[PDB]
Amino acid sequence: SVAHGLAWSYYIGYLRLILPELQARIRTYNQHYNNLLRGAVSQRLYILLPLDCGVPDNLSMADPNIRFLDKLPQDRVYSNSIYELLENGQRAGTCVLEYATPLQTLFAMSQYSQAGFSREDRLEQAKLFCRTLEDILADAPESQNNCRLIAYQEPADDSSFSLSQEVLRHLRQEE
Amino acid sequence: SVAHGLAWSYYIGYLRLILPELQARIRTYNQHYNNLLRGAVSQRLYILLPLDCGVPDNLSMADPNIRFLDKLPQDRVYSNSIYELLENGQRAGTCVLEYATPLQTLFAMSQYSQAGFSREDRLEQAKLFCRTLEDILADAPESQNNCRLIAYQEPADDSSFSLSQEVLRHLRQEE
Ligand SMILES: [Ca+2]
């Protein structure tokens, strides 16, 4: 099961490094664009976990209601992004939002014949990745409340899917 | 069984990306950065895989007989390093050398109390990581002939082990 290693690597190699100073970075950003914003950038890292492992390199196309606002400023250096979430045509929220890159690995594997990795396998591992990461975060309260996991599938009944609504539903669980 | 995911992530997200253009960068380098007495750089990525997962944040400080020579120059950016290997003071070879970074993840895990991840578990995963990666590489020849995995365990009598000697053993049996 690749999911297990993938989740631990993601946590140990990335989340555990960046989450500690996140709260300070967004704050610094908030203080300096407070004139322009008011409608402060919310504080947690929102991690998108599309279970179909479909990962554009751009929420700048994923949803008309998600719009790139700005780069969150400040071996590995971290390029986080701030986005506004619209609803009813209005800005309804702003948050640091990104895809869980290990889902790309799972996707690449399923596309790599020698991996012997079926579509059923990939989805199952994606689910296992999400679950494992949740368990990891559960045991690190400090990190668990510095980020939010947003896992989703697009509906079978080809009714319309809203990535922004998915994000907003979590973002409103807090405040 | 974190080793599974670590190996696949390392292959998909790094090795399979970098190995395709390795021999080109090495060829290119073996001239256009003219240094009179510089020796030819060997053709493959040599990857250090200590089973104890002990990765120094350097590479030279583990062994004075491994000496940094140059950065291998390159749409992502990659940091690879060239070293000369000494034997009785003499230059016995020149190669592109680095540690397998996923072993750092295994070491960090064993240090992370809540992982429930012991030194014994770490060694088991380290071996599995090597075996898994070797298996992956075997079914990807165009990438297997471009790198060499150097897995080793260190004898309790450290006077009986030299990291440079280990690299040299592999370096000597090839082109
Ligand atoms: Ca010893």
Side-chain angles (χ1 to χ4, degrees), chain A residues 24-44:
Chain A
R25 284 168 61 205
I26 56 216
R27 196 37 203 35
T28 291
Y29 180 92
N30 277 332
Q31 241 179 201
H32 290 62
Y33 289 93
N34 193 17
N35 299 318
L36 177 66
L37 297 147
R38 33 199 50 95
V41 174
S42 62
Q43 255 183 340
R44 299 174 169 86

Side-chain angles (χ1 to χ4, degrees), chain A residues 5 8-14 16-17 75-76, chain B residues 2 6 10 14 47-59 98-112 117 122 125-126 129:
Chain A
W8 273 102
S9 176
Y10 186 56
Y11 179 73
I12 292 297
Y14 178 72
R16 201 176 57 153
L17 293 176
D75 67 337
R76 317 179 65 183
Chain B
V2 297
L6 296 177
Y10 186 57
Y14 177 67
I47 303 179
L48 296 172
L49 293 144
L51 295 183
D52 71 0
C53 297
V55 177
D57 299 283
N58 71 88
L59 203 177
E98 62 188 50
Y99 284 92
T101 50
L103 294 180
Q104 295 179 291
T105 305
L106 290 179
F107 188 84
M109 290 186 52
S110 65
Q111 301 298 275
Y112 186 71
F117 197 66
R122 191 182 75 213
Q125 293 310 298
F129 174 88

Side-chain angles (χ1 to χ4, degrees), chain B residues 4-138:
Chain B
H4 291 153
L6 296 177
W8 273 104
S9 179
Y10 186 57
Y11 175 76
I12 287 296
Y14 177 67
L15 289 187
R16 78 167 189 153
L17 296 187
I18 228 199
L19 296 190
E21 54 273 12
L22 186 64
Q23 91 174 34
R25 301 166 65 198
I26 286 175
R27 286 189 287 96
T28 290
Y29 184 88
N30 277 338
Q31 61 234 11
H32 285 81
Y33 196 177
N34 287 334
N35 185 346
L36 190 67
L37 308 184
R38 191 186 63 221
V41 177
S42 290
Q43 263 303 359
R44 304 183 179 39
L45 187 60
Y46 286 85
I47 303 179
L48 296 172
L49 293 144
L51 295 183
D52 71 0
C53 297
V55 177
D57 299 283
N58 71 88
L59 203 177
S60 352
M61 219 65 68
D63 191 353
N65 285 323
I66 308 182
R67 306 195 316 195
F68 170 92
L69 244 192
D70 210 350
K71 302 299 294 182
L72 187 68
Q74 301 91 0
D75 195 283
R76 172 70 159 76
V77 62
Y78 290 115
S79 181
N80 309 114
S81 293
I82 301 163
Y83 302 78
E84 54 178 30
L85 306 168
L86 315 189
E87 182 174 75
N88 292 316
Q90 300 155 320
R91 177 173 71 208
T94 310
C95 72
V96 190
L97 180 67
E98 62 188 50
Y99 284 92
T101 50
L103 294 180
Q104 295 179 291
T105 305
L106 290 179
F107 188 84
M109 290 186 52
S110 65
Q111 301 298 275
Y112 186 71
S113 297
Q114 274 298 334
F117 197 66
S118 72
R119 154 119 204 63
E120 291 75 355
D121 300 331
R122 191 182 75 213
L123 179 60
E124 280 296 305
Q125 293 310 298
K127 294 177 185 167
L128 184 55
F129 174 88
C130 296
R131 149 76 182 263
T132 303
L133 190 60
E134 289 199 331
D135 286 347
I136 295 173
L137 282 169

Side-chain angles (χ1 to χ4, degrees), chain B residues 154-159:
Chain B
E154 302 157 35
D157 173 25
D158 30 311
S159 85

